[PDB]
Design a protein around this ligand. Structure first.
Ligand SMILES: *[C@@H]1O[C@H](CO)[C@@H](O[C@@H]2O[C@H](CO)[C@@H](O[C@H]3O[C@H](CO[C@H]4O[C@H](CO)[C@@H](O)[C@H](O)[C@@H]4O)[C@@H](O)[C@H](O[C@H]4O[C@H](CO)[C@@H](O)[C@H](O)[C@@H]4O)[C@@H]3O)[C@H](O)[C@H]2NC(C)=O)[C@H](O)[C@H]1NC(C)=O
Ligand code: 2KS
Ligand code: 2KS
Ligand code: NAG
Ligand code: NAG
Ligand code: NAG
Ligand code: NAG
Ligand code: NAG
Ligand code: NAG
Ligand code: NAG
Ligand code: NAG
Ligand code: NAG
Ligand code: NAG
Ligand code: NAG
Ligand code: NAG
Lengths: 733, 727
């Protein structure tokens, strides 16, 4: 049979089918089929055409995405999409009136709009344009301007700045509608004193002078953005007077120094919760604020504050977890690290500071998925004690011992990694199995957890793959100091334990990372194993996630130590297994994985022949404040400067004489600045070490344009094949 | 025997000795030996100590260079040297009184001085600090501030901006003292509307945020700097009132549009010549301006104005040539292209517009070296009709038939490439032979052109090289269309014509370039031939210099055409010779050579297996106005935009699928911006071509720091050895 080739990976020859649905009520969902939008009845599976595909070709522009208003009366059409950072972008928007069957051409949403969202009920709109918030009560009516302070690179109303987008909210939006749309809450960021990262952008060859891009970006220890929080009543807006936004200030325990706003969650129509985090990220406070009809303001009762702190590390996996409120808003459930360091669900009364754990054990709750008056639904890695598996469970709120696994036994050989999507009041749920077999999407009814139907089983892909020599995946563990550490191996087809294969260690190894799991993937590793007969291994060592704080917090204030040593030890253990050619072990990684790859290659271990670092961090003072300081503290003599100075790639330059290294970086990387690799290369040149390099003009952290993505994987494949003494092949052109 | 290795090249194991002297009169010169400065009598060769190496033992700073005042009374000590561009730098200066044995401690030259020069006689000083000119009449006395308009990156008084430094004057200074030091002439450049090139500078690893460097740099067709010219009388300066500078305006034929000041040459104590060039560089005007004692003004009479134009190309090799005036300033000699397109010496009377050619032939005069009362001394490539040779000649002013070759027959097998250094009134001259044998420095008397003595013969290097398997050099020509085109080959030791060797074509090929010559060099090519047994060839095709305008102007308005095609043809002709392995032909070059290498690799010729481009130009709109427009005109639809768009490397990207390419560039290149290689790589990625790259953090066009220089040649050697399958 044929193998899974590099061209198969780069041209997406073998495509994974999805079943992306959008719940619109407790019994119906929308699903896009052959460019038409269909509405499905969950109980019976029958459908009706909601919006014909022809409608999308009526405007003359190509439509990037759509958003139907919750009441189904309007459709927001997104076009002229222009990407900014990981989540941010600008676009033009048109609104189509579904009952009048006509495009709205008056009081349009402006071009270069930064963010738009419908209210959660009805059809109000809030949008951000030129860093200011606007609200439209009706799609054809003039907007009400909420803020007047917006200023490019300085004041951000209702949108995040660079560091809040990447590191705090994982979103460009900083707008939160109340459940029924009466109130609009928003954050305002002030970057006045934040230094700018500056880099060249070359653009099309017609551009005679390169542009200098300047982005407010706080590097470790630098001046951070400041934040304010406001709530506006959208039902009392006037065309005669400016809108009154009510400020909610941070608690004084936060105002004493630098801090962040890290979570916004509405509890009821008149109650909002906010979580704040100190700049030293081991102390956070939740405020619960109620609307006061007598003053028109928001009161955050001091008696309702909840403190969450950590003595061994930072708070949360990446940030404090979100609360899930009961309907009355008087209690909530939240994932918290317990006394043993395992993340479990805790039940709180809004006026009481001691919470009660409702789950326990040497495993962790990943997320709370739905909450009804009778049950709480959650995803955990409890099943078979496999940290890299995921299953859906339900717990009776009247008896915590009554826990049922909803997904564990549905198809145990094919499905060990689930996510879920519940209908509006959780009468139904879609289960999404992503491995170890081909992804499988199914629909279920909550009343008795009855399976209704299979939505997508990837039978088309299965038929195609029967004719390909596909690799296999092994997930297992090694024991180090009486602790299990998990690894995975992508094994070549017809794997023979009596033969010696070359091995590539694929690394991430950042705090809370997980690279050993049960997910089915078709990626570069699939080609390396299928066509090139390379074993591609990954290992989750100290600092990795979902296995408790004793493992995750092991690298607290000490990045570039145990997680680096544990990758080296894993490669030694893989050599001890007997089917690995110890003369052909390589390592590669991107981002944090590029940093770890570089630290490993500079260790002088003698284990690795070669390695590739893509967009690596090289020195923690070059990376952003929020992520870096979470694990490293501040780069000051009084805090952790000594470790910042001891954990650079540059200090290990002399040891690179022992290895073959390929260093790759996009010149327009706004995230891990090209500076980081420019300093690695300069250090290697300064000690006389030869190495290979590749810059990618105008590519960012993703090196994700169609042509650059094909080019980088082609270049890396040649490098690994040459390191491993694997043959080349001529092609006509 | 051992070979000449890469470490020998990088560590300078085998050193070429020089003999750098400084003439102080018509009979004596200074020579630095064992840090002592000696004064030599040219006639007899005896010496005396001028300044002992112990004088400045307690100075407290490492001295970079020195400059003795023309009257020998003072010495300027340069220290704290900080490089800027190719020529520019700043430094600190101390003045030491050689008679009193005292360092000047008051009214010192400021730190961060941009330029300093003694007057040509005596000991006045002019300097530029913070873009303004200052004059000191005596080293211990306060300075007179001449200009008050200087402003970083905007107004430059007495110093050049980036483009005038690189492309017009080949110097940072823009100050010209009159012969006896009475007047100080200077240019002022105004870069207000010139766009800025911006690039990152990463600095030491301790720098948390990269710096953005911003330099006023006009790319092709962009707004250029403007220029003004002034003359100040330094004998009538006052501590009470500000100095009066007299402006000399450009002629109306220049003021009608954009133009450049391209030459300043004093003719007498009261007469200065200026040459101006239109932005379309095929028309130049020389004004001869006289001081008017009655008005205090400088007048340039049209009766003494001379035009120089070209109908086939630009004016001059790189710019209009310098005039050499007779002592009375009533006539001058200048190299001009003749009716046949060969550059020869023309004699002009200041008020007569038709000049008389004093030399002629199918060869060219390279430079006028000295003009005495009876003879003119010049360097040419006449000898044996070899364009890549250089010899010194003299011609009698009253009889152009009385020519003597002064260097041709001295040592004809060892020496075919000379330069010269004459004493103050040319009674003596030092000849400097740079090849084809080991360099040889000798001293001569011009009384009857008799040799006095050998100054340095490199016998120490010769003894060391006898134990090394050194390569040889062949210089010859091929005939194409009844025209000779010259090439050179660096041949491996024990070269066997019956065997096939890999070949590397080392390219420059820019307008007026010459890569085939008789110079002896110890460089990367020496290692490739000596250790790796690679033939390193270079070829001078259309557009090359010193062979007349029919060859040089062949690429006018058409860069990236004939000079590219002729490198490909040369490699085909080298294959036709029989000792070349046609499966192992590579090409490399730096700067314009990187552009030609890239254009050749993108040609689809199938001749070359691999190549390396270092800091290449990729598209002429990215390079500076003065150099680019000289050959290309303006990038406008009405002028030459179509050819600017047709001559890019990016347009050839698909053809790179046929070759192995290594692209290298310094990130802080202020000259050929990193942008140029960033656009090549993006075009190759866009068509799915694999290639090799290397950036050099914070390196400029020279990639010349000790560590980066060693790294780039090591990386390139690995690449060529892998291309040629050499262990
Ligand atoms: C290289 O060697 C050259 C040859 O010796 C050096 O030239 C000589 O320089 C000295 C000093 O400048 C000259 O000295 C005296 O010259 C006359 C007398 O000249 C007669 O006698 C000389 C031998 O003693 C002969 O060489 C002459 O040809 C001639 O017959 C004196 O009258 C001078 O006296 C005056 O100056 C001195 C100070 O220098 C005072 O002390 C006296 O009181 C008086 O005022 C000189 O003593 C010498 O003439 C000259 N010889 C030449 C050129 O032939 C040359 O300097 C040296 N170069 C270097 C760099 O080392
Ligand atoms: N910039 C940080 C990351 C990075 C890149 C480059 C160098 C170093 C590090 C990239 C993103 C990633 O996000 C984790 C997701 C968190 C999340 C999201 C939603 C809800 C809860 C948590 C972590 C590593
Ligand atoms: N920037 C132009 C040059 C260049 C670099 C990079 C890309 C393209 C081109 C470099 C310098 C060089 O100068 C020649 C010398 C002229 C001269 C000097 C003194 C007196 C008379 C003539 C020509 C090519
Ligand atoms: C599905 O069928 C029922 C009748 O059994 C009907 O009421 C419902 O509207 C249908 N839904 C869709 C989306 O077609
Ligand atoms: C958006 O831009 C287009 C193109 O310039 C313009 O025609 C249109 O009117 C703009 N729309 C709005 C809402 O301003
Ligand atoms: C932003 O912060 C700066 C201080 O860094 C302050 O001067 C300015 O008033 C603030 N602007 C707003 C709109 O809050
Ligand atoms: C609203 O605020 C803006 C900005 O401060 C101001 O220009 C405008 O006049 C205000 N409008 C009213 C109606 O007060
Ligand atoms: C939405 O909530 C607000 C605040 O309690 C309330 O005044 C309003 O009536 C609610 N809307 C509806 C439709 O009940
Ligand atoms: C938070 O971290 C700092 C730095 O390690 C430490 O001084 C402080 O005590 C920690 N706080 C808690 C709650 O442990
Ligand atoms: C130059 O700088 C040094 C060091 O600061 C200082 O001592 C000296 O006085 C300065 N010279 C002048 C002329 O200002
Ligand atoms: C420099 O030129 C600008 C116009 O480009 C002009 O405004 C300015 O006055 C000039 N400055 C001097 C000192 O000549
Ligand atoms: C000289 O010119 C400068 C700059 O215009 C001025 O400040 C100074 O007063 C002038 N001095 C005299 C004496 O005129
Ligand atoms: C220098 O030349 C000028 C101009 O002719 C003259 O006035 C001056 O006196 C000359 N100086 C000497 C020392 O002869
Ligand atoms: C100078 O060059 C331009 C452009 O080629 C041309 O129009 C003009 O005629 C030239 N002048 C001469 C004297 O050839
Ligand atoms: C030789 O002449 C031919 C015919 O005109 C031309 O195509 C070719 O470019 C010339 N080659 C040279 C001058 O090297």
């Amino acid at each position: 049979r044929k193998t899974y080739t590099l061209t198969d990976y780069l041209k997406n020859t073998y495509r994974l089918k999805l079943y992306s649905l959008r719940w619109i009520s407790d019994h119906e969902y929308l699903y896009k089929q052959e460019n038409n939008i269909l509405v499905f009845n969950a109980e019976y599976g029958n459908s009706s055409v909601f919006l014909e595909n022809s409608t999308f070709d009526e405007f003359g522009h190509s439509i990037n995405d759509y958003s139907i208003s919750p009441d189904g009366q309007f459709i927001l059409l997104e076009y002229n999409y222009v990407k900014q950072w990981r989540h941010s972008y600008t676009a033009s928007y048109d609104i189509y009136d579904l009952n009048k069957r006509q495009l709205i051409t008056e009081e349009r949403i402006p071009n270069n709009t930064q963010w738009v969202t419908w209210s959660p009920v009805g059809h109000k709109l809030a949008y951000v344009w030129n860093n200011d918030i606007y609200v439209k009560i009706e799609p054809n009516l003039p907007s009400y301007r909420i803020t007047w302070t917006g200023k490019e690179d300085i004041i951000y109303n209702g949108i995040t700045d660079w560091v809040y987008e990447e590191e705090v909210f994982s979103a460009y939006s900083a707008l939160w509608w109340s459940p029924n749309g009466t109130f609009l809450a928003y954050a305002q960021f002030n970057d006045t004193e934040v230094p700018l990262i500056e880099y060249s952008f070359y653009s099309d060859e017609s551009l005679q002078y390169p542009k200098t891009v300047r982005v407010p970006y706080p590097k470790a220890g630098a001046v951070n953005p400041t934040v304010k929080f406001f709530v506006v009543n959208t039902d009392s807006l006037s065309s005669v007077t400016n809108a009154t936004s009510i400020q909610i200030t941070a608690p004084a325990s936060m105002l004493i120094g630098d801090h962040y706003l890290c979570d916004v969650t509405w509890a009821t129509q008149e109650r909002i919760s906010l979580q704040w985090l100190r700049r030293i990220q081991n102390y956070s406070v939740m405020d619960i604020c109620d609307y006061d009809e007598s003053s028109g303001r928001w009161n955050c009762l001091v008696a309702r504050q909840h403190i969450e702190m950590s003595t061994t590390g930072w708070v949360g996996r990446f940030r404090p977890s979100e609360p899930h409120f009961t309907l009355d808003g008087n209690s909530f459930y939240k994932i918290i690290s317990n006394e043993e360091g395992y993340r479990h669900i805790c039940y709180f009364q809004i006026d009481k500071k001691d919470c009660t754990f409702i789950t326990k054990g040497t495993w962790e709750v990943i997320g709370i998925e739905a909450l009804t008056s009778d049950y709480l639904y959650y995803i955990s890695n409890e099943y078979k004690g496999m940290p890299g598996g995921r299953n859906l469970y339900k717990i009776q709120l009247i008896d915590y011992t009554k826990v049922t696994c909803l997904s564990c036994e549905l198809n145990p050989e094919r499905c060990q990694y689930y996510s879920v999507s519940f209908s509006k009041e959780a009468k139904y749920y879609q289960l999404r199995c992503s491995g170890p077999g081909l992804p499988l999407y199914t629909l279920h009814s909550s009343v008795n957890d009855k399976g209704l139907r299979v939505l997508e089983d990837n039978s088309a892909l299965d038929k195609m793959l029967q004719n390909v020599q596909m690799p296999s995946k092994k997930l297992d563990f090694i024991i180090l100091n009486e602790t299990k550490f998990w690894y995975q191996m992508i094994l070549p087809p017809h794997f023979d334990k009596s033969k010696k294969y070359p091995l590539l260690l694929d690394v991430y190894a950042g705090p809370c990372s997980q690279k050993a799991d049960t997910v089915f993937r078709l990626n570069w590793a699939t080609y390396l194993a299928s066509t090139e007969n390379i074993i591609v291994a990954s290992f989750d060592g100290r600092g990795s996630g979902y296995q408790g704080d004793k493992i995750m917090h092991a690298i607290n204030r000490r990045l570039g130590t145990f997680e680096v040593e544990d990758q080296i030890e894993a490669a030694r253990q893989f050599s001890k297994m007997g089917f690995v050619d110890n003369k052909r072990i390589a390592i590669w990684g991107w981002s944090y994985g590029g940093y770890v790859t570089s630290m490993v290659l500079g260790s002088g271990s003698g284990v690795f022949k070669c390695g590739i670092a893509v967009a690596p961090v090289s020195r923690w003072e070059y990376y952003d404040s929020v992520y870096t300081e979470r694990y490293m503290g501040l780069p000051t003599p009084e805090d952790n400067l000594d470790h910042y100075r001891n954990s650079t790639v540059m200090s290990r330059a002399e040891n690179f004489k022992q290895v073959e290294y390929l260093l790759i970086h996009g010149t327009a990387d706004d995230n891990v600045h090209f500076q980081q690799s420019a300093q690695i290369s300069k250090a290697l040149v300064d000690v006389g070490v030869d190495f290979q390099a590749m810059w990618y003009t105008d590519e960012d952290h993703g090196i994700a344009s169609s042509t650059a993505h094909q080019h980088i994987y082609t270049h890396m494949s040649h490098f690994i094949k040459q390191c491993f003494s694997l043959p080349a092949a001529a092609s006509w052109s």
